[PDB]
Amino acid sequence: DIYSRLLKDRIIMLGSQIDDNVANSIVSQLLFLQAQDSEKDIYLYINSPGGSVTAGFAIYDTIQHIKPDVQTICIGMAASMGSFLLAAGAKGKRFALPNAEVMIHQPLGGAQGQATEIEIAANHILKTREKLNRILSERTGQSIEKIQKDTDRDNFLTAEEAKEYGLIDEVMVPE
Amino acid sequence: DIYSRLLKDRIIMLGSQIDDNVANSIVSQLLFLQAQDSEKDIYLYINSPGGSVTAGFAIYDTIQHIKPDVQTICIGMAASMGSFLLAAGAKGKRFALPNAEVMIHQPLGGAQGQATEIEIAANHILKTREKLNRILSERTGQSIEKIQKDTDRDNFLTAEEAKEYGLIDEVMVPE
Amino acid sequence: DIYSRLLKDRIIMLGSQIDDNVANSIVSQLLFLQAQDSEKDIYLYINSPGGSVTAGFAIYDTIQHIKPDVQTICIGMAASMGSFLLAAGAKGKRFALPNAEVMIHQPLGGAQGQATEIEIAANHILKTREKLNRILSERTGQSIEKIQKDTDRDNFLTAEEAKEYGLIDEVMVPE
Amino acid sequence: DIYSRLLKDRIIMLGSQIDDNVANSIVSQLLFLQAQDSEKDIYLYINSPGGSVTAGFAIYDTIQHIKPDVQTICIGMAASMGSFLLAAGAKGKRFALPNAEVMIHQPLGGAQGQATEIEIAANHILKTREKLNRILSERTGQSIEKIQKDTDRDNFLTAEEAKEYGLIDEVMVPE
Amino acid sequence: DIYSRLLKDRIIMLGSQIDDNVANSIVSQLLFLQAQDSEKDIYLYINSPGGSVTAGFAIYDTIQHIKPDVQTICIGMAASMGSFLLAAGAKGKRFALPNAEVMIHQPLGGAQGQATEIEIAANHILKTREKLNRILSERTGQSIEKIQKDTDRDNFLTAEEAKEYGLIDEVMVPE
Amino acid sequence: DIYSRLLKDRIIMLGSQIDDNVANSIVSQLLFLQAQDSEKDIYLYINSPGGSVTAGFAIYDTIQHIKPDVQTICIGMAASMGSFLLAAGAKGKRFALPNAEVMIHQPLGGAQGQATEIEIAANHILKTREKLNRILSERTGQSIEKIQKDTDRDNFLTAEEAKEYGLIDEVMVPE
Amino acid sequence: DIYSRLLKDRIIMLGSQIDDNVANSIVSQLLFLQAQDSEKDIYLYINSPGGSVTAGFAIYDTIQHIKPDVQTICIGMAASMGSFLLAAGAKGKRFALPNAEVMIHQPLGGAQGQATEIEIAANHILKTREKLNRILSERTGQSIEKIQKDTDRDNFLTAEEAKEYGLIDEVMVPE
Amino acid sequence: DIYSRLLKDRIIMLGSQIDDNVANSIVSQLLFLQAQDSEKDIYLYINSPGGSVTAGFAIYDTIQHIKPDVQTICIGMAASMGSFLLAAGAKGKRFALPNAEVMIHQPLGGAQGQATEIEIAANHILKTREKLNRILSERTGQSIEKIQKDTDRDNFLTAEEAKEYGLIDEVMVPE
Amino acid sequence: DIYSRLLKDRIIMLGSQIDDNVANSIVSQLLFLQAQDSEKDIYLYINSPGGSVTAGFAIYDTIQHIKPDVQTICIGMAASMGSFLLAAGAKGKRFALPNAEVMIHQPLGGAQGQATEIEIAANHILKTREKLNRILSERTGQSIEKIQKDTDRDNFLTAEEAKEYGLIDEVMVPE
Amino acid sequence: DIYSRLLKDRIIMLGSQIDDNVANSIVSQLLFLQAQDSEKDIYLYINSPGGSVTAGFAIYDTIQHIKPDVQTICIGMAASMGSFLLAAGAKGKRFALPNAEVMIHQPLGGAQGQATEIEIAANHILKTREKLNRILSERTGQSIEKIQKDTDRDNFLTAEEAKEYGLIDEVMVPE
Ligand SMILES: CC(C)C[C@@H](NC(=O)[C@H](Cc1ccccc1)NC(=O)c1cnccn1)B(O)O
Ligand SMILES: CC(C)C[C@@H](NC(=O)[C@H](Cc1ccccc1)NC(=O)c1cnccn1)B(O)O
Ligand SMILES: CC(C)C[C@@H](NC(=O)[C@H](Cc1ccccc1)NC(=O)c1cnccn1)B(O)O
Ligand SMILES: CC(C)C[C@@H](NC(=O)[C@H](Cc1ccccc1)NC(=O)c1cnccn1)B(O)O
Ligand SMILES: CC(C)C[C@@H](NC(=O)[C@H](Cc1ccccc1)NC(=O)c1cnccn1)B(O)O
Ligand SMILES: CC(C)C[C@@H](NC(=O)[C@H](Cc1ccccc1)NC(=O)c1cnccn1)B(O)O
Ligand SMILES: CC(C)C[C@@H](NC(=O)[C@H](Cc1ccccc1)NC(=O)c1cnccn1)B(O)O
Ligand SMILES: CC(C)C[C@@H](NC(=O)[C@H](Cc1ccccc1)NC(=O)c1cnccn1)B(O)O
Ligand SMILES: CC(C)C[C@@H](NC(=O)[C@H](Cc1ccccc1)NC(=O)c1cnccn1)B(O)O
Ligand SMILES: CC(C)C[C@@H](NC(=O)[C@H](Cc1ccccc1)NC(=O)c1cnccn1)B(O)O
């Protein structure tokens, strides 16, 4: 299988929606790569429309925890939790290809039941948003109040705009 | 039709779920009965599992607004917005048959979408619960804190317990 | 319509499963009949497999509340809440045809959700069973503990067994 | 409507599956006809594939109970509970048109649940079959054990065979 | 039918979602009422969650065009196009009952297909929003800029808040 | 019924999608109104999203073919065949309410099967478009070239724009 | 397989809902790892929304039974039965990554059928909640009264709050 | 695969509902293990909600027939036929983990068709229940009369209660 | 597998709809091929109906971003994003077989929700179309306005027409 | 796998409907076979009901473009695009088994949407039919005018008739 080959070059492809299955695969790949060698870089290609917040945080925390630097490279599109993980790469080693698109927006969810259950769910998603904003602020240098306003609705960015936003460090030019 | 002849005796049957169709029928019947005679009493029989809050308030406010006293008679069951409307009858003229059951609980709803929209919906239903608690406190004489605690979960009441609670004035004995 | 003609003779047909629609129709027919004449007997024919408890209690309490005697006549079958309403007729005026079947059993229901919600639902249905047992004991003369054992599972009775049970007073012979 | 003009000639058409709705319609038509005149004959045309045992007994017991003779005339087909009601007409006044088919067979049913519940359901339907076999033996002049043997499976009979069997008295010839 | 005799009191009930069927019914009632008498007032009760913009404008333009004053009375809820029609009543004669809910928000829609067809749909709905904002500014005295910001998301208003906003003129007290 | 009342005033409401049922109803109403009086005007109110071309042409040809002038009044919306019929009213007597919308676009259809079957269906719809374009050109005073270009995609028009275009003669102002 | 290589390092990934299939896989992995070496530690990564109580106890009891210490590491989320198993790791060796979320709440279930069946199911789930509360009390040091109040509704905890609660021993810092 | 290496340690995992597929897998594992060695023990782990009686007896009879002792160890849950197989292990060698649950109840089934087919099915399931009771009485030392009463409804047992009942010999402690 | 033997000749088959899975496979194969040899040509056979813009740009940017020349050979059909990638091959090395079809058209999409959300989606797809038009203008030597007009609707091109258009350099002759 | 073994003898079996997956498999097998040896003959067995035109042309153009002669052998049936590929084998090496059936007919498709879109699709399928007719004229020696008339509807041919027609060169006799 072709991805088996790429893993020998320490390359991980995140090329789908992020659910728990995908997150456990990515996490296990990071841990496996760290075991083989704990100082050579890892390369995480990202072509993802987003997905679950907790699954995304499973990958995020693993990236920060392991010893090797994790380079992130957006090809095609990094939207929602995909752009959050793009910004999570080793600073100075976060890239996008020239025609890649990046999109940021606020979390989405749902809640049903009694008034108290809806209040619990609303409080949980607002806390989850404040937590995502605070971390994105630390990864980009944007202020939390600006993240909050810029993610009120869907916010599409070119690769160059993503760099000026601080989500990546360089647009990768050919070749 | 049987209900049309009962209407000539100024009797209205609320015997179903409360949605907008039912609420409009009940409201129009109260209006029509007030026009025919504005001082003879009206009798509202209630056998209802509850329904929409705004459809319920359409009936509640029409009862409060018109001239005639509206007697409320719970037969079978008055649950949720049903029991709220039972408590809304003219004071001294709120009844339940001996084996009727009354149930009270907090509102239920749902919300989907972005975090800010879920927060808007959560705030709306909590505000709605506060409004219902306040009115029920006025109709029963119980405190708002007691209502709030007693409606945290489904709360089933006998006709006698509903009288002790202040939801009704008397249990109707034969004949 | 044929049932309209029978209502002229103060005859009500209960020939279906008992839900809120059926109960409100039956209740309105009883009240309409009492208005026309409050001393002439009413005849309630019962061919019913049962239905909702609260809908059944809407009919029960109305029968006990109005002035006229309500005679009950089982044709075909009175099961579950149907036999409960059969036993509710004016004492001495509860009948069944010779090949009618009567069936008694304990209530059924369902509950889903949190442990506390299931606890609340279980407590409500056990309270509802104790109430049904107590009233059936008063209508039949059977002890509450015998009702409890006899309704543990489905209990089919001939018309003659139903009379010796106290659910009816006489088996109607031709003509 | 055509059937109500026929009711003025004391003609009742049973022309469908026998459920509770149909049984209550037929029963009410018999009582109504007896009320208008309690001596003049009633004519019950039967074209039915059968139906519910209890619904059929509602019609059967009403036929035996009223004062007027009830003639039964099979047109097209009287199967299962249909043929039971065909045999139920006033003796000497049970007919079939020359090309009508009569079918008899044993009761069918179903049972789901615990072993004790399946035993209760089996006993009930076996008792039901014995009661039907006994009545048909009285109405036809055949032995119970012959009825049992001849209904073990679907048993189709011509009009002439139904007369030979005792289910009807005469085959109706033109004119 | 109850709504028929209410119409003789010049009362119209808008108690459902607004589609073309409902709109054509309301419009024909307004025309019919003007034909019988063209100076006596008309009373339009509103309990509606909203609906189609063009259906709503059929009712709006008819209200403005006919000669009689059209009073608007919100019972239960006036949301979206329902609250737009509430504010369309004759000034000084727009009411809400004390527990009625009013909600305002921006239009919603959908678009599918080629880029140029999506552009056509976006331009059409933004033009529609500008037209709604401008009319609501005229009916309420609020500025278009405030309407735009206040309708960005769902905005729930009590009867008292709707009066302060200018959507209604008075909250209707008993009796 | 309310529409029967309006038809005595020679008012016809076209308030739905135009299919064959609707067309036959409108056509029969026009024929019936012409028979009652062949000189007094007829008023066709239009709130329609369009529909079938042949159903539309049934109404169109009938309007052209009856002696009385047929006034057309767009309320809410006249799109597609709806706006074609709006433009078909007696010149000088075509109206729209101030907030009515008008939309024009080319016909739509489908074709499946062999190549020669698809070619036949393509030629039939192109000939249909050319006929519709020519007739609309004559009703509006526009060139066929301009109609063709302006209906290539969905084209939304305000009431004032529709008057400028020649689809209506006057915007109806209040009173 | 990537999970196969991690099993070489005595790492087990519980990254899904807990049903019987998953529980048997986790149990067999623990058994297999103990047989290979009964004194080297085992590492249980948890990213789970929870699941079946009995499947959870199959894993819990196997963890307690075997010789090796079992470290638990919450990545992403440990909700419900997932957080119960997180607290079950060897004391001193229960961890969570800094942005992992932990949630605790009371059990859920369902019951259908006769009143006595519903009572049996209610008693079972309440007994199951008492058992879980008691064990969690032992694992965290919190009182059973506190657990019972804190799990009445969904209760979301940060990694730091989970440490304060006693569900984990340390938050894992990089690197 | 993990279960293969466990089979080398003579471990069999019964961790699912028991149907014919599972039974044939378990049976072939028992025979395969006997062929390799006919005197060393076999270990059957049981986490099962139950299943088919005949599939269960395929496993039961195979366990009794082969030479090696089969230890049974309930993890998580042994319900219905699962608890029957738990009690089927070699006496002295039947265990449950401390938080395992055990449930016993009477068989369930269904029957549809003619009265004689229902009677056949009823007799077959009653015979099956007598056979299960007699074997369980032998495995546990309890009387058949007590088994019959204790299995009338669902009967949940802790590991300790199962030992007292005789279903297991010991609750296995760590480690 | 046949495609892996072709990969050793540096042949990549793009023979399906272009989604993220396909894009990541193609990207992985380009990277892998560049790693084995960074100067020898790569051959990308294209038989595709098109697909996702972002997935297509993942392949496009990878093609421009590797050192080796990528020849593109259209077999069967290159439509939509398929034809975009066909034009993306190394200039002078873009081919089509004599009977391959090439189709170009403008992007398609959808948008649902509030007016502001629809405007965001419309602007994003219009910007996407502009970006695609500019690149195709550079790759084909046609003007932006000609690309815009020629893609307003589906535009089918033979292999020879595709060469005249600049989408390919040569039509590949036999053999 | 059996088809792998036959590829050793340079045998490719086209035995299914022709879509893009199948076409890419066949194309890749031809290229792979040409790589191993570019002068040994290839044998393509055809048993196909047809399929996509563009997928068929992918196979056709590859057959003409490789160096080796491709023999075509129809077994069972070559219908529609299947017979087109049969006629495409190296002249003198196109065969059919004596009972194989051959069928030719004109292309089929479908179109939906605006009139201009149906015209585009009609023109495209007509152009495709003309290209198919011209190539088959060249492969068979029949005139385009004869192909056009013979493919108006389904035209079934025996192996012998296919030889007379020019679709094949010889009917294969045993052995
Ligand atoms: C940066 C952030 C915007 C990324 C993703 N956003 C989300 O909102 C996801 C959407 C979702 C996915 C599957 C199932 C339901 C919901 N929401 C949650 O995981 C969540 C978290 N905490 C509480 C409630 N929900 B993105 O891909 O859009
Ligand atoms: C508690 C009692 C006094 C009244 C009723 N309780 C409710 O929860 C209803 C239930 C509902 C069901 C289906 C669809 C919608 C609503 N909730 C609302 O109307 C509502 C209002 N505002 C915000 C959110 N929800 B009862 O009678 O059922
Ligand atoms: C004498 C009595 C045995 C009669 C009826 N028995 C019942 O169990 C009904 C059945 C039912 C039917 C449809 C949907 C749900 C339940 N149960 C309730 O109404 C109920 C349940 N829980 C709490 C309060 N009430 B019988 O006639 O079916
Ligand atoms: C003389 C007699 C043979 C006539 C009818 N026979 C039946 O079996 C009916 C069929 C049926 C229809 C609807 C729903 C269930 C069953 N059975 C019962 O009504 C029944 C069953 N079990 C216990 C009590 N009653 B016939 O018309 O076929
Ligand atoms: C702001 C408030 C006055 C709006 C009310 N209606 C809407 O937003 C509707 C929603 C809808 C209803 C039926 C069918 C489709 C869509 N949208 C349109 O009608 C529409 C959309 N795009 C262009 C033009 N019009 B309210 O009830 O929400
Ligand atoms: C353009 C405008 C003046 C009128 C309407 N346009 C249409 O295309 C309708 C839509 C349709 C309805 C039912 C079934 C299929 C299609 N098309 C036809 O009736 C038709 C199509 N092909 C040949 C002949 N007739 B409008 O409402 O959009
Ligand atoms: C850890 C605990 C606080 C909640 C966890 N599980 C539950 O509540 C489950 C929900 C469920 C899932 C699948 C199938 C059935 C039920 N309930 C039961 O297993 C159960 C046990 N005994 C009696 C009744 N129910 B958690 O992970 O949600
Ligand atoms: C007491 C306890 C040991 C019962 C176990 N099984 C059953 O009761 C099953 C339920 C069932 C399962 C699959 C298909 C159909 C029915 N019933 C039968 O197998 C059966 C056999 N013969 C006659 C009638 N029924 B337990 O494990 O659930
Ligand atoms: C490049 C041009 C020749 C058209 C090609 N692709 C498209 O139009 C796709 C269609 C699609 C289908 C399913 C899911 C998503 C998109 N549209 C987009 O990707 C898109 C989405 N949002 C904004 C901008 N673009 B071609 O292959 O049809
Ligand atoms: C040999 C030839 C005369 C007929 C063969 N195929 C066709 O006619 C297919 C039918 C079809 C199959 C799959 C999907 C869509 C349509 N049509 C096209 O491929 C097509 C052509 N031109 C424009 C658009 N589509 B045969 O095998 O039937």
Curated annotation (Swiss-Prot), chains A, B, C, D, E, F, G, H, I, J:
CDD domains for the chain: S14_ClpP_2 (cd07017)
An MF annotation (GO) of this entry: ATP-dependent peptidase activity
Pfam assignment, any one: CLP_protease
Reactions catalysed, as given in the entry: Hydrolysis of proteins to small peptides in the presence of ATP and magnesium. alpha-casein is the usual test substrate. In the absence of ATP, only oligopeptides shorter than five residues are hydrolyzed (such as succinyl-Leu-Tyr-|-NHMec, and Leu-Tyr-Leu-|-Tyr-Trp, in which cleavage of the -Tyr-|-Leu- and -Tyr-|-Trp bonds also occurs)
Keywords: Cytoplasm, Hydrolase, Protease, Serine protease
Gene3D superfamilies hit by this protein: 2-enoyl-CoA Hydratase, Chain A, domain 1
Signal peptide, first to last residue: none
Gene Ontology CC entries for this record: cytoplasm; endopeptidase Clp complex
Keyword Cytoplasm (UniProt): yes
Protein's UniProt keywords contain Plastid: no
InterPro entries per the UniProt record, alphabetical: ClpP (IPR001907), ClpP/crotonase-like_dom_sf (IPR029045), ClpP/TepA (IPR023562), ClpP_His_AS (IPR033135), ClpP_Ser_AS (IPR018215)
Localization per record: Cytoplasm
GO biological process, one term: protein quality control for misfolded or incompletely synthesized proteins
Active site: 80 (nucleophile), 105
Uppermost EC category: hydrolase
EC number: 3.4.21.92
PANTHER family associated with the record: ATP-DEPENDENT CLP PROTEASE PROTEOLYTIC SUBUNIT (PTHR10381:SF70)
Subunit field text: Fourteen ClpP subunits assemble into 2 heptameric rings which stack back to back to give a disk-like structure with a central cavity, resembling the structure of eukaryotic proteasomes.
Entries under NCBIfam families matching the protein: clpP, PRK00277.1, PRK12553.1
Function comment: Cleaves peptides in various proteins in a process that requires ATP hydrolysis. Has a chymotrypsin-like activity. Plays a major role in the degradation of misfolded proteins.
Family statement: Belongs to the peptidase S14 family.
Protein's name in the database: ATP-dependent Clp protease proteolytic subunit
Species this chain originates from: Staphylococcus aureus (strain bovine RF122 / ET3-1)
